[PDB]
Paper text:
The recently identified bacterial Sir2 domain-containing protein, defense-associated sirtuin 2 ([name]), recognizes the phage tail tube and depletes NAD+ to abort phage propagation, which is counteracted by the phage-encoded DSR anti-defense 1 ([name]), but their molecular mechanisms remain unclear. [name] contains an N-terminal Sir2 domain that serves as an NADase effector responsible for NAD+ hydrolysis, a C-terminal domain (CTD) that functions as a sensor for detecting invading phages (as discussed later), and a middle domain (MID) that connects the Sir2 effector and the CTD sensor. [name] forms a tetramer with its C-terminal sensor domains (CTDs) in two distinct conformations: CTDclosed or CTDopen. Monomeric, rather than oligomeric, tail tube proteins preferentially bind to CTDclosed and activate Sir2 for NAD+ hydrolysis.
To further investigate the molecular mechanism of tube-mediated [name] activation and [name]-mediated [name] inhibition, we initially considered whether the binding of [name] might prevents the binding of NAD+ to [name], leading to an inhibition of its NADase activity. To test this hypothesis, we incubated the 1 mM NAD+ with the [name]–[name] complex and determined a 2.9-Å cryo-EM structure of the resulting [name]–[name]–NAD+ complex. We observed a strong density corresponding to the NAD+ molecule, occupying the same position as NAD+ in the DSR2H171A–tube complex. In contrast to the weak density observed for the nicotinamide and nicotinamide-ribose groups of NAD+ bound to the DSR2H171A–tube complex, the corresponding density observed in the [name]–[name]–NAD+ complex is much stronger, indicative of stable NAD+ binding. The NAD+ present in the [name]–[name]–NAD+ complex adopts an inactive conformation, as the conserved catalytic residue H171 is unable to access the nicotinamide-ribose group for catalysis. Superimposing the structures of the [name]–[name] and NAD+-bound [name]–[name] complexes revealed minimal conformational changes in [name] upon NAD+ binding. These findings indicate that the [name]–[name] complex can bind to NAD+ but does not catalyze its hydrolysis. However, we observed a [name]:[name] binding ratio of 4:2 in both the [name]–[name] and [name]–[name]–NAD+ complexes when [name] and [name] were co-expressed in the same bacterial cells. Affinity chromatography analysis further confirmed an excess of [name], ruling out the possibility that the [name]:[name] binding ratio of 4:2 was due to the inability of [name] to saturate [name], as observed with the tube proteins. These findings indicate that the binding of [name] to [name] in a [name]:[name] binding ratio of 4:2 is sufficient to inhibit tube-mediated [name] activation.
Residue numbers in the entry:
A (entry chain E): 11 to 126
B (entry chain B): 336 to 463, 467 to 495, 501 to 565, 579 to 636, 644 to 897, 911 to 1005
C (entry chain A): 22 to 74, 79 to 462, 468 to 629, 645 to 670
């Protein structure tokens, strides 16, 4: 947990951990992580409200979320050390009260925007 | 040390005890009557000295100092990235050994390090004043170091490349075995070591420690800025005009980074202090732009942007900067549009091209030059450096100072059509690091052309069938760019029978207005969730808040999801259940609507005040300051 | 190989590194490039003189007889037609050059060594005649003791006939004296010579007349097909030669001479960077050789240690060593393994054990702990043992009053005087230390130049703005003292101070060189800037790292610099640039501390640093932000 960072702009965490999770349809995804992109200046449509967009990458390739992604974390594995960081992951998820408390990497698109 | 020469072109006597030869020389230069006395040989020698001093920008003594025009002018093809001219120069036959030294430097600058090393060896053979010999030895050692580092990097790192043949690598390793750069100067003829002592520093591993340590004067808070800038210009001119390869090493790049960054930060600090005192600085030019592009990584540019208000930095010589950018675009096209990609040259040049196109946001670009830059960035920029999202970020940054013209819109439409055509394969997918994809380019096009309709994308949708689903769902995110008939053709390919289909359509943009059946779908989902009580809930709460639903029956689902109740009935919500982190998720539109609700605005104001007072969070503070929620 | 051969290799490589290696290249190396051996010329002369076709004396006699009989023109023509042939340069010429010899003496008339030097990018002033000695354009000589054909392929330009050898000392006095001086003052390696060679034995006869232990035994690279007989080796090694036998070096044929030469040349070259340490005793001996000179200094900056070991290991400011460029044996890892395992320590010798104990004390007091892999909870207290730092003005005055029991006490007294404003007394004490005194002598030269600079700046301010600021014309320094200091220091160049030192000092105290200029502040300064950026970047984006602080490196480097400058009593502690560096480091630390607090505590050292190195405006800016 020495590489864990708390990004407060979007109250999430950056941690190099993959996740094994079971969705609401019993589907199994392995070695999946999340990438958050904080885009407040993003060109927003009528029904778009969220400030940051999250992508899911399983086995090095992203996934298209065509269904409700209600999921529960079954296992969390750290890359630098194979130690299971699950319980800490659940603790942080409970504390944060935000979607996807832990993210593989956060991409800040505010400073690279022309309007910044 | 008999005299000290200012970086602004003036001399001051110090440590000189005998005759004031510098003052006498300046007096002689000022008046030709006193010059007429000198003998013929002395007259020619004075003329040569005057040429040298004017060329090197030494004007007069401190007392004579007046309107000093200190304009930088680096006469080097390598500095301006005139790669075609450098190649032409290398192709042509070299008349002398000085042209061979220039050729070797240009070959080093073009990534042709083997040819440059061989040319340096030839110059060393044929050059034994000995100044070119010493400089060639220095540059050959530098190029050997560069080759070694490049070999190490390529061994460590996307595809396996072997720019230097193992035979050549072994030959250079044997030739440079036990080679000492420290002893190079001491081994030179004593006449050389006397005449050319000033070149000693070129044999040292570090030569910018003095210049770097003099940068602390930019961090003071109590001209230093002009001194630092002129010192940097002096170093650049000396290293480039003299064709020294150490101008490409990490030490010099870091020195330029530090100097430019500290100069900009000092200018920003002066600006803020002046605003605080008077209650309402760094003027960048072509050379500053080139230095920032070449010696700055994208991370360094981002640090500059976040630290300072670079939008307040006026950019000068913008036509020259646009010429630089267009030349970079042409070089990118040559490197990639053709098959002339040099691995060694590309490694170094891609960073400068990326930084130049990133920094171009601050420069007004002519329509034709803007089109050239845009096409080069969109099409011929390698994907291993700019992925789809990064390329979109680069492109959108260019609209800050140049409203998207029709030609640039056509270029973006061409890119979109090519992206769609690439989707015929069921395995090709857009890879983005910023999370931005082709739909983002379409959104930008509609932003600057609201009623713009893409004819070729419309046709591509009008040719789609039930088979190539990839093209189908790709064109769904490009729905606004499609025509009415194309929109109708695409819409038939998705079903909204269940709520999840509605969510997917809304996310992809299939449906933008909630039809009554959509509201009833949301309602049945709410009923099922309520029944099963003993993720989208906040989404529907926001939609009702955002006036995206006029059902007026959602209130039946109040009392289980804090965000939903908070959004449906802000007045009746108990704000002890409010989580301030919610405000960190809403975008500008939702936060502004919350602030303007005229209800619950005081609750959010007090929560934000508590957050700012207890955590000093800049995000909460900026939320409160911008929308005053 | 044999122990004596390895000792010869070590001595040769040490000389090559020190720039005191001279190569005496004979005719064998030239013949290695197929150059015509002299016996061919002698046989041609014999065939011309008599019907048809040599002893050592015949070598000189037959050319002499042919000269006297057939004319200088005939002798010269034979030489020209036989020698006016271009030949390639051997890989052994390039090996000799790659050994980095200070000088290359040679008895060859060819330009093969000249061509190799020209190709390898080595500038040697070629001395082949008497006039060339005074006209030498460089300080490194390519000395052709027997002449050459650069002037022309004439028999009077080279030493071939017997008369030439008889009158050599009279015809080549300058060249002979130069050769003897180079032999006396350098390490000589003979290659391409037979042990029974005329020139080698003449040189041995000359060496016979020298003092018993006034010269270094030349190294003789013997590359004859068969191993040297023990009797011959005994005879020639007692004559002042240390023989490296190639036949004993490797197995070879009878007529493959290039392989025999290359064996020795490569074995020498590849040993250039070889520490030649395998057992723990040798590793500890090498480490002590590297670290013992530093025992003079009170404290050594960890970032400086990388220069002590020629970038073999990174010495991080947290006390962890890391392999950087030590392709050879890992001696720091071995040393730390010895340190951890007490049982191994006894396995070392008595002297080796004492040296290891001294090294352990040095490393422990300098905060060097272990390698990165073995690093644990590395926490260190920052204590500076200096009276000047803690502002013990009364204590420094009392110490100054006391009597100097050593030159080190004089150094500390001079530093304290500089720190008490008594610059004239401090300068006089520094001059006295220079006279009495060489680490302290060099540091005293540097400190005296710094104090002279401070005196000059103070006088400038007092005379230019001192009257306006104080409302009075203050004269802290008498005009006599100012004139004397100007006279003394006007001829002093700080830049060349380090070079004007015994080469052993420049090898053992390289790290002190940086004290000449602000280069000693370079690395840290650069790091600071980088770290600043990084830290600011984080605070710009609101990220809150967990664990090791990104600014702890800045604090560690800051205290490293403070300890090195104050405990070593260097006037650089008063420099404007050093004050700016300290101020920037502390400002970054305080800003990061505040940022973390909102989501480091100020101590005595932090308070003293802020007070001493911060202006009031800087403190006000810190309070504002
Ligand atoms: N009268 C003669 O001396 C004569 C005449 C013709 C041939 N030869 C034979 O041919 C060879 C000529 O050499 P030398 O007798 O003058 O040696 P030498 O013993 O006179 O010279 C000794 C040194 O020269 C080197 N050397 C000897 N032969 C070499 C070769 N062929 N190539 C490169 N280096 C060599 C060795 O390394 C040795 O250190 C010898 O083997 C000799 O027996 C001798």
């Amino acid at each position: 947990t020495h590489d864990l960072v708390y990004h407060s702009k979007i109250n999430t965490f950056v941690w190099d951990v993959e996740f094994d999770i079971v969705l609401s349809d019993s589907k199994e995804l392995n070695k999946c992580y999340f990438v958050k992109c904080f885009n407040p200046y993003r060109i927003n449509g009528k029904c778009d409200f969220a400030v940051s967009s999250i992508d899911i990458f399983s086995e090095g390739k992203r996934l298209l979320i065509e269904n409700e992604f209600n999921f529960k974390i079954t296992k969390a594995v750290h890359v630098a050390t194979s130690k299971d960081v699950t319980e800490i992951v659940l603790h942080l998820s409970e504390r944060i009260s935000s979607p996807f408390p832990i993210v593989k990497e956060v991409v800040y698109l505010d400073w690279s925007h022309p309007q910044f | 040390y008999d005299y000290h020469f200012e970086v602004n072109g003036t001399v001051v006597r110090h440590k000189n005890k005998g005759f004031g030869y510098m003052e006498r020389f300046f007096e002689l230069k000022e008046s030709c009557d006193e010059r007429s006395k000198l003998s013929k040989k002395q007259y020619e020698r004075f003329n040569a000295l005057f040429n040298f001093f004017e060329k090197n920008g030494v004007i007069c003594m401190a007392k004579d100092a007046g309107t000093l025009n200190t304009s930088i002018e680096i006469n080097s093809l390598a500095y301006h990235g005139k790669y075609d001219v450098m190649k032409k120069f290398i192709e042509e036959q070299s008349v002398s050994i000085e042209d061979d030294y220039k050729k070797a430097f240009f070959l080093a600058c073009l990534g042709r390090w083997e040819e440059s090393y061989d040319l340096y060896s030839n110059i060393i053979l044929n050059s034994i004043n000995g100044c070119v010999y010493y400089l060639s030895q220095i540059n050959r050692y530098r190029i050997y170091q560069s080759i070694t580092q490049a070999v190490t990097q390529f061994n460590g790192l996307g595809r396996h490349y072997k720019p230097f043949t193992d035979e050549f690598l072994a030959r250079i390793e044997r030739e440079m075995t036990n080679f000492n750069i420290d002893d190079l100067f001491n081994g030179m003829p004593f006449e050389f070591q006397k005449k050319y002592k000033i070149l000693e520093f070129l044999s040292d591993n570090q030569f910018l420690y003095d210049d770097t340590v003099k940068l602390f004067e930019l961090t003071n808070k109590v001209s230093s800025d002009i001194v630092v800038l002129l010192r940097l210009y002096d170093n650049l001119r000396f290293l480039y005009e003299n064709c020294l390869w150490s101008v490409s090493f990490h030490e010099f790049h870091q020195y330029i980074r530090n100097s430019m960054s500290l100069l900009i930060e000092k200018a920003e600090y002066e600006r803020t202090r002046d605003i605080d005192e008077l209650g309402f600085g760094f003027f960048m030019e072509y050379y500053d732009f080139v230095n920032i592009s070449r010696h700055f990584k994208i991370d360094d540019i981002k640090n500059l942007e976040r630290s300072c208000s670079i939008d307040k930095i006026r950019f000068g010589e913008q036509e020259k900067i646009e010429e630089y950018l267009v030349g970079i675009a042409e070089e990118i096209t040559k490197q990639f549009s053709a098959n002339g990609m040099n691995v060694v040259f590309y490694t170094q040049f891609i960073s400068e091209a990326k930084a130049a196109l990133y920094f171009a946001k601050y420069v007004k670009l002519s329509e034709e030059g803007l089109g050239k830059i845009v096409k080069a960035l969109l099409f011929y920029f390698p994907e291993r450096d700019l992925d789809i999202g990064k390329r979109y970020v680069w492109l959108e940054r260019l609209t800050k100072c140049n409203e998207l013209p029709k030609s640039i819109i056509s270029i973006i439409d061409d890119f979109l059509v090519l992206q769609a055509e690439k989707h015929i394969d069921q395995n090709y997918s857009e890879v983005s690091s910023n999370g931005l994809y082709s739909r983002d380019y379409g959104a930008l096009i509609k932003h600057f052309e609201k009623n713009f309709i893409s004819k070729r994308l419309s046709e591509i949708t009008l040719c789609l069938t039930q088979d190539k689903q990839k093209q189908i769902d790709f064109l769904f995110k490009l729905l606004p760019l499609l025509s009415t008939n194309a929109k109708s053709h695409l819409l038939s390919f998705k079903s909204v029978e269940n709520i999840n289909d509605l969510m997917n359509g809304i996310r992809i943009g299939l449906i933008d207005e909630f039809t009554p059946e959509h509201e009833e779908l949301i309602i049945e989902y709410l009923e099922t969730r309520k029944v099963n009580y003993i993720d989208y809930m906040s989404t529907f709460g926001i939609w009702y808040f955002l006036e995206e639903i006029n059902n007026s029956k959602m209130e039946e689902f109040i009392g289980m999801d804090d965000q939903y109740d908070f959004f449906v009935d802000p007045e009746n919500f108990d704000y002890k259940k409010f989580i301030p982190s919610w405000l960190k998720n809403y975008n500008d539109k939702l936060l502004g609507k919350i602030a303007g609700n005229k209800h619950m605005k005081h609750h959010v104001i007090e929560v934000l005040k508590e957050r700012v007072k207890n955590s000093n969070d800049k995000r909460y503070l900026e939320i409160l300051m911008n929308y005053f929620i | 190989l044999d122990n004596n051969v390895v000792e010869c290799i070590k001595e040769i490589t040490e000389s090559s590194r020190n720039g005191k290696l001279v190569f005496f290249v004979g005719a064998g190396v030239s013949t290695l490039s197929d150059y015509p051996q002299w016996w061919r010329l002698v046989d041609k002369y014999h065939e011309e003189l008599y019907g048809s076709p040599y002893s050592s004396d015949e070598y000189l006699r037959i050319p002499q007889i042919f000269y006297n009989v057939k004319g200088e023109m005939a002798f010269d023509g034979i030489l020209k037609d036989f020698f006016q042939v271009d030949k390639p340069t051997n890989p052994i010429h390039d090996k000799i050059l790659a050994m980095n010899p200070a000088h290359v003496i040679t008895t060859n008339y060819d330009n093969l060594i000249d061509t190799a030097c020209w190709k390898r990018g080595k500038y040697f002033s070629v001395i082949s005649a008497e006039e060339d000695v005074a006209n030498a354009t460089s300080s490194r000589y390519l000395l052709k003791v027997h002449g050459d054909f650069r002037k022309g392929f004439k028999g009077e330009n080279v030493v071939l006939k017997e008369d030439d050898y008889l009158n050599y000392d009279q015809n080549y006095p300058l060249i002979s004296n130069l050769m003897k001086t180079i032999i006396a003052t350098h390490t000589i390696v003979f290659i391409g010579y037979g042990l029974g060679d005329y020139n080698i034995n003449m040189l041995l006869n000359w060496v016979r007349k020298l003092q018993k232990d006034s010269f270094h035994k030349p190294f003789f690279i013997r590359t004859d097909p068969s191993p040297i007989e023990n009797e011959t080796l005994i005879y020639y090694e007692n004559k002042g030669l240390r023989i490296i036998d190639a036949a004993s070096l490797i197995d070879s044929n009878e007529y493959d001479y290039l392989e025999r030469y290359s064996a020795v040349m490569d074995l020498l070259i590849e040993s250039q960077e070889n520490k030649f340490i395998t057992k723990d005793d040798e590793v500890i001996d090498y480490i002590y050789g590297k670290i013992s000179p530093l025992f003079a200094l009170q404290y050594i900056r960890k970032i400086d240690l990388k220069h002590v070991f020629e970038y073999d290991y990174h010495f991080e400011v947290n006390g962890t060593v890391v392999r950087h460029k030590n392709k050879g044996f890992g001696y720091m890892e071995r040393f730390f393994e010895l340190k951890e395992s007490c049982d191994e320590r006894s396995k070392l010798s008595k002297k080796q054990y004492e040296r290891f104990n001294a090294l352990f004390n040095f490393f422990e007091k300098n905060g060097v702990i272990c390698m990165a892999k073995d690093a644990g909870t590395l926490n260190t207290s920052i204590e500076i043992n200096s009276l000047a730092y803690h502002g013990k003005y009364d204590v420094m005055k009392k110490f100054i009053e006391e009597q100097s029991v050593s030159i080190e006490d004089d150094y500390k007294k001079a530093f304290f005087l500089a720190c008490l404003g008594r610059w004239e007394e401090s300068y006089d004490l520094y001059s006295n230390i220079i006279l009495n005194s060489g680490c302290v002598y060099y540091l005293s030269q540097i400190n005296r130049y710094r104090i002279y600079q401070s005196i000059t700046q103070a006088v400038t301010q007092f005379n230019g703005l001192g009257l306006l600021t104080f409302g009075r014309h203050y004269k802290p320094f008498t005009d006599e003292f100012l004139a004397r200091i100007e006279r003394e220091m006007t001829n002093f160049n700080i830049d060349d101070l380090f070079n004007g030192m015994p080469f052993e000092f420049q090898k053992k105290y390289k790290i002190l060189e940086f004290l000449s200029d602000n280069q000693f502040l370079y690395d840290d300064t650069v790091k600071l800037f980088e770290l600043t950026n990084k830290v600011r970047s984080e605070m710009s984006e609101g990220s809150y790292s967990f664990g090791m602080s990104s600014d702890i490196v800045v604090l560690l480097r800051l205290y490293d610099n403070l300890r090195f400058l104050y405990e070593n009593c260097l006037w650089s502690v008063s420099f404007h640039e050093f004050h700016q560096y300290i101020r920037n480091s502390m400002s970054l630390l305080i800003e990061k501390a505040e940022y973390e607090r909102t989501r480091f505590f100020m101590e005595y050292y932090d308070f003293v640093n802020i007070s001493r190195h911060f202006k009031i405006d800087d403190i006000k800016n810190l309070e504002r932000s």
